[PDB]
Write an enzyme that holds these catalytic residues in place. Sequence first.
Site, PDB file in Angstrom:
ATOM      1  CE1 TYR A  91      -3.837   1.776   0.147  1.00 57.05           C
ATOM      2  CE2 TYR A  91      -3.708   1.873   2.488  1.00 57.05           C
ATOM      3  CZ  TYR A  91      -4.331   2.180   1.328  1.00 57.05           C
ATOM      4  OH  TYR A  91      -5.463   2.917   1.409  1.00 57.05           O
ATOM      5  NE  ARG A 138      -7.761  15.259  -4.337  1.00 52.58           N
ATOM      6  CZ  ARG A 138      -7.146  15.443  -3.166  1.00 52.58           C
ATOM      7  NH1 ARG A 138      -6.568  14.435  -2.508  1.00 52.58           N
ATOM      8  NH2 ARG A 138      -7.098  16.669  -2.652  1.00 52.58           N
ATOM      9  CE  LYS A 159      -7.095   2.676  -1.070  1.00 54.25           C
ATOM     10  NZ  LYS A 159      -7.805   2.991   0.196  1.00 54.25           N
ATOM     11  CD  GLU A 215      -9.856   3.849  -2.281  1.00 50.97           C
ATOM     12  OE1 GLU A 215     -10.132   3.172  -1.257  1.00 50.97           O
ATOM     13  OE2 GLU A 215      -9.089   4.871  -2.247  1.00 50.97           O
ATOM     14  CG  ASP A 216      -6.710   7.535  -4.920  1.00 47.62           C
ATOM     15  OD1 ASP A 216      -6.869   8.216  -3.860  1.00 47.62           O
ATOM     16  OD2 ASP A 216      -5.730   6.776  -5.000  1.00 47.62           O
ATOM     17  CG  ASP A 267     -10.950   4.310   1.940  1.00 46.87           C
ATOM     18  OD1 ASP A 267     -11.545   4.128   3.032  1.00 46.87           O
ATOM     19  OD2 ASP A 267      -9.696   4.257   1.760  1.00 46.87           O
ATOM     20  CG  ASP A 268      -9.933   8.626  -1.198  1.00 43.62           C
ATOM     21  OD1 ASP A 268      -8.868   8.166  -0.723  1.00 43.62           O
ATOM     22  OD2 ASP A 268     -10.443   8.185  -2.296  1.00 43.62           O
ATOM     23  CG  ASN A 296      -1.084  11.194   4.380  1.00 45.50           C
ATOM     24  OD1 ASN A 296      -0.220  10.617   5.021  1.00 45.50           O
ATOM     25  ND2 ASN A 296      -2.374  11.037   4.620  1.00 45.50           N
TER      26      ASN A 296
END
Lengths: 553, 557, 554, 58
Positions: free
Chosen positions: B105, B158, B176, B248-249, B271-272, B413
Amino acid sequence: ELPVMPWATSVASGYTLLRDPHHNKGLAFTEEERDGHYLRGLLPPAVLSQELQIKKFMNTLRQYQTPLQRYIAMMNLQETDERLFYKLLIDNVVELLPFVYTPTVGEACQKYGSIFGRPQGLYVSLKDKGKVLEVLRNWPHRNIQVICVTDGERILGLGDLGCQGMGIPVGKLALYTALGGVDPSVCLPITIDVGTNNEKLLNDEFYIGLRQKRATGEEYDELIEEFMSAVKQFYGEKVLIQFEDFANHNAFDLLEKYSKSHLVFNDDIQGTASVVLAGLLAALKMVGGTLAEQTYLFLGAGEAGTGIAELIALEISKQTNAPIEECRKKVWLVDSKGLIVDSRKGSLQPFKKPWAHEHEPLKTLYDAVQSIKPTVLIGTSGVGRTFTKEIIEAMSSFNERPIIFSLSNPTSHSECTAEQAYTWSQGRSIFASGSPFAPVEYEGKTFVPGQSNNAYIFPGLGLGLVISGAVRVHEDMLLAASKALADQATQDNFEKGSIFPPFTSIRKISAHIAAAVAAKAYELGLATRLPPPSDLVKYAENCMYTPVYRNYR
Amino acid sequence: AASEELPVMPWATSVASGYTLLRDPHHNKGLAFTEEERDGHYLRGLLPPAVLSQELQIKKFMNTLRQYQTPLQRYIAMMNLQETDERLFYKLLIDNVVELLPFVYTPTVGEACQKYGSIFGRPQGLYVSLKDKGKVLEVLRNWPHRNIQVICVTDGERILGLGDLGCQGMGIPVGKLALYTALGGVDPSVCLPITIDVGTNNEKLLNDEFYIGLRQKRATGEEYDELIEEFMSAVKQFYGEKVLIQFEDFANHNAFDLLEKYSKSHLVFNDDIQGTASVVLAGLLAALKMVGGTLAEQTYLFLGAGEAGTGIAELIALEISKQTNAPIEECRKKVWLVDSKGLIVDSRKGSLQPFKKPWAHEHEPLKTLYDAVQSIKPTVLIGTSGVGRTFTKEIIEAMSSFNERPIIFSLSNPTSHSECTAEQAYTWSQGRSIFASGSPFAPVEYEGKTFVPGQSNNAYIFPGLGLGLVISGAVRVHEDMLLAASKALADQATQDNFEKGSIFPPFTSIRKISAHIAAAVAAKAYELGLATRLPPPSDLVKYAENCMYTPVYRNYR
Amino acid sequence: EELPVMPWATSVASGYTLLRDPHHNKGLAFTEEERDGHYLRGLLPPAVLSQELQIKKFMNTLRQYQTPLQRYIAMMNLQETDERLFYKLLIDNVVELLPFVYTPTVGEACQKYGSIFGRPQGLYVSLKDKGKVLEVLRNWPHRNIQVICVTDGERILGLGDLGCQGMGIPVGKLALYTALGGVDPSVCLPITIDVGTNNEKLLNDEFYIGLRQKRATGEEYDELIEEFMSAVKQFYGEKVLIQFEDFANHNAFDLLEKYSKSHLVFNDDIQGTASVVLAGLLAALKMVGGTLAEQTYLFLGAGEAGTGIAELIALEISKQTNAPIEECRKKVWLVDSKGLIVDSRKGSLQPFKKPWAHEHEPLKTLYDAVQSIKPTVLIGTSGVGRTFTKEIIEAMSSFNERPIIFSLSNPTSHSECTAEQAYTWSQGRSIFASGSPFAPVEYEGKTFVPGQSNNAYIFPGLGLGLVISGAVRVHEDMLLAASKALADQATQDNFEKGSIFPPFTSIRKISAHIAAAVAAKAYELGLATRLPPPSDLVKYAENCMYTPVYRNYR
Amino acid sequence: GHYLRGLLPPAVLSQELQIKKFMNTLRQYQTPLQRYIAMMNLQETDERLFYKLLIDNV
Ligand SMILES: [K+]
Ligand code: NA
Ligand code: NA
Ligand code: NA
Ligand code: NA
Ligand code: NA
Ligand code: NA
Ligand code: NA
Ligand code: NA
Ligand code: NA
Ligand code: NA
Ligand code: NA
Ligand code: NA
Ligand code: NA
């Protein structure tokens, strides 16, 4: 931590596709299917519809002169193009049922080794002791929901045919699909081979089974126990196990043990009882009267006899609200030693005792018919020609419309024929039989006798269990099925003398039976597919397998 | 009727034997095939004579993995293993989770997506492109596992802090889902990683000879919406109403619109947005158990008022609502946010994007974070701004001057974008800050004590949350399931973590943490009437543990 | 044909079945149409990458691995995932990649094989398969086998007994048959015979892949080998080539002796190495003048490999001069572990050393032998590194103007000396070649590019020659013909750099010529069965060669 | 060895008895065309039985 079989998955092409019965369309592969799956050249240029394929096969099938050749060509079709097999059967069910089912299946079982061609079903033998689970893993369809299983000890009325009894479960499950709409990929025919006491088969070079006498006692019970445990471990709690054509002692013991731990149905004890009950509800709808007002006499007091009688008594208790012991008082059975009566209580097998009423002993069916004067005569002895002219004339002498059910199979073992029942009763018998008879012209009137065979019941009953996620069978499901079948009976049928609708209505009948069975599973708290759908009849209809060909990517 | 006529795949089956067995990663055991299995599946001679246990294969693999010199080489060796012996991969990963998580990950997986074309080896996942318009369902039909229960899907726009990596974002959902299996016990055979390729705006990738996606700029507006709609409708038709679709993303505005369009019609989760909200809430709940106090008694100050950040706020407010029985409008009033322009306040309402307006309380305007910290005096300060070093010494000292134990979360992050370092938070608060961050920091020694700061990783939450949805037959994600996950995570935080200053339990306990989360999510699903696996079992913890995939080899004879 | 058979099903590969089959898998080179017709859409990302761009991509990551062994590992993994890509990558980057898939890195791979074992390669036949060898051969899924390379792992390079971990050798040898000689990889079968190992370190290693016992010997060993050789004949027929690799010297000789009469067999260590050395000497004398008959030859190592090289030099001298073979041995000397092989020792020598036991004072050390015999050629076969010392090379360089020095032992760490040492201690004057590769040497402004006297120059064309002519036996004259074909390819272009052989960038052309000359010789001797002979053998050899360019699939 | 256990009934029949069995049903077909259909079906089910039957009953 059971061992597992590692299966590889791949896209079927070319001869792999042509040789797989589940996917083979033969000449019905389309232009695009052929170009995507490397079939060009392997088939001739012309594309033939499924409907023309049916017509072609029916054309050659009617040129085979013996019923056994037609059974053979049907089984060969089943094992080459499964969807054609099922569409053909469904669309021609009235004509084809005598060839894939009773009577011809009986002859197939007697001669099974001499005609054995393409393998069908799974054989589990004594030689697989300790490795049953091992054998089940070789079956290539993982998601099994319906098992039909026999030991071949009592095939129809033909006795012990050993490992050649496989034609019965193979037959039964084809009807689950064709009549009941159960997906064939979730059906598993099984024969358990523990030997045979049939001398002729032990000495026949083509017998396909273990050449030894039947195992009994512990050796038998341990193999059955390992089988039933393996089924549960491999297929889960909801797999339907249908027992077929076991002998009396075994059939009763199996139902007694496994109906507490598994979803089980015995077709001879419970299926037959249910269809006969429906036939009685319809017979009384045509000629008036109540079930409680009748007097019943049975020839034959094993599985089917006692089971039918118990179910009739049970429905009498529901309609009268009386205790079950009262409801048995006008149900009488005759076995090989004669009338079953209190003075014999000394030494009857357990399943016969509740039927032993206070009465003079009588040796023969004819004397019992004379003394008891039944409104209803039901034969399940497995012994042909046992409903004599003298007996039918008697039944016709003291009832205006005697109800005569000749249930033994195949045709040669029928207690009497439809011809004999209508003539010897001067057109007045309400007649139904296990095996099919053609219409009878008597004194310028047409009679169409109904087939009182558990094929009207088991397909929808099993579908009901499956769509509901039932985990046990309860007697109220049998009464719910009987009532759903009788409720399909119409004036049209009754005018022809037919206590059942014809098999051309069978999908609709099966959907109503399933819906009533499932409803009952929900009501008793035995269903696990929660919540119920909003219309059970629609849901059953929509669940049913259609054998129209798929298009392939 | 028309969907009965749709062409299907004619799949056939056969017994796998020999090289067909050795080349299928789902069944391949390598040297762990027993003598009996070798004799029964035509493997004798294709392997050397020795049989090696699963435990020795793990040890063997670890020894070589540790000799690779770069993180990316370790990623490549791990992906190769996933694609040749799946049960070995999962067991290796579970038993070495702390050491390997950074290789398979975050952060190494980001680097892999950056370089995904140049290291592309064995294929993983399913790619759906703009060129499959009108035929998306035909692509799903090519995936040889029929019963899919978990999809993780990206458009690659992203990826972490790395921007738009187009079709090379597939590394994210692949990673994931590995975590869903290893940390969550989801069976890998029911997991489907999907990349939707609609182009990329990354000019470097558009000129890279090794780029694996469509060589065009991203589709937007209607073309994009239609492809997504076809994908979501095909997913429903082929896998049914219960399949989980994890987004995701995606870019931010997009991520929220998909979540709002498809939460009505499918089981979906981002998730984000949702996962991060839930893990942060869990962290606050653990922190307050460490230092006393209720969620309701706190005053909260966020630096960063992005749409993702306001969702953290909204979940804190919703949980305050549950503990208090007060309307949520009352519970938002002790949650404040600062933007580029300063404190979000009522008098700015006219020039505020709409998602900020619920936080725009009555107050004098304040232009800076420092002035907001001195005026409002929060007990809890949370950084989501993406700008490093915005929690200065002046800020940490202010926070530490009017709180005994100030709660300080630097969630941005990677480490360079962290609002502050762990070294800073503990030094500048004289050892008194409760600290947690999005990025990993080494322990800090300060005067006497050793501090191990918790890490705000949403792998603490997503694996058990998805397990909980799957085992209940949940058909919609409800915000109360996110509350239930957060409480279940915080309840696993022991005094051992608190002694070291860690508000989260360590990843060594993750399998047990997942089963508790899954149980709490499932229990909520039954409570809200959103579960279809009826009736509920009586002991949901036990049931969740017994549903968990174990990667111990099967026996084949 | 009471012979059981394996029933094999055949079907059209698609989907994952295509991707996971190394023989067909093209990865991102599958074209649009191949993808749409084989259920690959979605399983691969949208882009289509050519074969050449795959090679470039793979070389880029390959060069970032820090250790030679890591590169070997990445290359085996590529051979087992996309065969055509592996062989094209290797052929187009052959100079760079050879040291990673062959000597020296293959040596380390064998030493650590259990610890790096990933994708299965080759077939393992053990003592536990006794009575059932044929049944094990039936498990190999490629039916038309034409070349077997087999070892028991007893003498792997100069590294000793590595038991079942010797597999790396035949596997590497067969890759060279394909890359360097154009033999189709589908017709190659690498085999390791596992009869145990005397290496205690392996017997105690938890990762050792072999039988955990000491080596079987005597009748027990011979029975397994006999069943094996009989099984190969029954299953693959009379024309299958069996190349023996890395047997101990006593077994190497006995097997060659016994099976030469019954099978088509070739020992790479005794015959291959003999042939590449002869070719090296023929080139070397083209470059500094003189005749094979006028040299004086000194060997370190009198194994059945050293004596094999010696015997072939004596044989070619015999052909060139007509002298009996016996007299052609008089100027060929060998040093074993007890010293120079000489007549006064003859009574107590193994029989194979006796033809070399010429009359001479007994000498204990190589150096004394070098100073007494004064060879013009020094050849090292010892398996012991650094035995060609400064004193030895300086001596060789004091009584010869151009001392010929062949340091044949592999891998690099067991080389008799390095190229740096050879050219330095000889003042730029040695004609040097080695078993393992060395970098260019700079000395007083001149650049020396030492040749590799390794049997990879010979076995690839030689086996191709046997295969295409349908040869049924190997004859010693085929070895002389291969030697001459290789030396005939050496030109002034390579002599100017000090390389006695053409570079590996010419290896397909070299292998076609070796194969043509081996095949001509099979026809000339009545050993060929592909009748009648084609008229241009070199062209035929070239046209027989495997190309790893991707196929198009319908 | 090939995962046939259960798929076939317990008895093993020799090639010769399969010939005899097929010849017995072949003779009961009423028409030549039916015998042809049955033979073609056997050629496409068990090739070796077909050819051995034909060679021995040529
Ligand atoms: K019967
Ligand atoms: Na029963
Ligand atoms: Na179909
Ligand atoms: Na990953
Ligand atoms: Na996006
Ligand atoms: Na989203
Ligand atoms: Na951070
Ligand atoms: Na979790
Ligand atoms: Na893929
Ligand atoms: Na190997
Ligand atoms: Na060397
Ligand atoms: Na079968
Ligand atoms: Na058996
Ligand atoms: Na044949």
